[PDB]
Amino acid sequence: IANQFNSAIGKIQDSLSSTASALGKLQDVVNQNAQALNTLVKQLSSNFGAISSVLNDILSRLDPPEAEVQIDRLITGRLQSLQTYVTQQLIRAAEIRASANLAATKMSECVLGQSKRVDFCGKGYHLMSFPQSAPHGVVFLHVTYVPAQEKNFTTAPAICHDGKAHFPREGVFVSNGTHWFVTQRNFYEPQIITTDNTFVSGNCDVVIGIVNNTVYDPLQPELDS
Amino acid sequence: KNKCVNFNFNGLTGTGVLTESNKKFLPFQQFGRDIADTTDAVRDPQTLEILDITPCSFGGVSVITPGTNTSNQVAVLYQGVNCTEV
């Protein structure tokens, strides 16, 4: 686990260094703001129906009563430009506040504690996360537990020994083709079937698919000794 | 130069601080513009020189004061500018 982790962190440094597009989510925010500012400014050069976009030009040509007619067109149009800008900033702000609430939620469930939610902290079973600062944002490195290699085994829902069905207290029943072993679902660690690893419930005539085997009782050699 | 003034050069006007820049206009280019199509620089119609246009200092005025029931002391904050008026 020390090699897998350290090797994984190394790939993070290589991916972020080689691939600059992984941060494009943050670059979009910069680009969107630049387009809005560049647009808002360039609208000053528009006539908006007026003779000219320059204020002093209209004032230096038309008479006072005639100029006001043309100046009003510039004021009206330029006013609409601000309304368009502010309207977009308010909407875009809602998208950022939604992401911020998501980031604050992950730090609590992912970073601070351990999250049982499915695929909230990323694929696999979440262990712990590393927060990292990023411009106008944040980065989360999520360490997860991903199962790799598996092998097909023979299973049974219950074991029958003395006539009472035995159920696993934890794990599942598996077999290599000879003896039935108990094992956890996330990994293969053979464990002998015993009264301590199983629970007695019902009889053997109910469970569908129950099989017969020998349940080892650790108390037998203790009483014989 | 190096002062806030209202300048009229040939057929162009504006208000700002004029300072000698390192920009070089071609012999036929009297004035430059920015990405926004705003004039960032000009060339003296009489002599040959390049002058960058820096808008005169402007910014917001923010008042920092405690509650009225606390004290009437106030602290003025000029945003986006160094200390000038004072």
């Binding site: 400014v41 | 926004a36 705003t38 986006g80």
Partner: peptide, 22 residues
């Protein structure tokens, strides 16, 4: 990851250093 018409860019409340110290 990386005007003159009266558009003001307000500075952030917390510097890049402070967010790194969090």
């Amino acid at each position: 990851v990386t005007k003159f018409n009266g558009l003001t860019v307000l500075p952030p409340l917390l510097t890049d250093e402070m967010i790194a110290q969090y």
